[PDB]
Amino acid sequence: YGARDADTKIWNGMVGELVYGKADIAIAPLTITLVREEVIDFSKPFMSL
């Protein structure tokens, strides 16, 4: 899904696929967290849990 690799400071997964390039939208179970919100742009929640 997405996490900052604390050694290399490089994202991965669906967050890292659109921060770093090759995606325009991420319609997927991407939980709204603070460390993701600083780099990507979430909608309002379509599902609560």
């Binding site: 899904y1 997964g13 669906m14 696929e17 659109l18 090759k22 995606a23 325009d24 939208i25 991420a26 319609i27 997927a28 179970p29």
Partner: peptide
């Protein structure tokens, strides 16, 4: 216009 590239899992 271009095709928007969804990335699901």
């Amino acid at each position: 216009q271009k095709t928007v590239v969804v990335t699901t899992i």
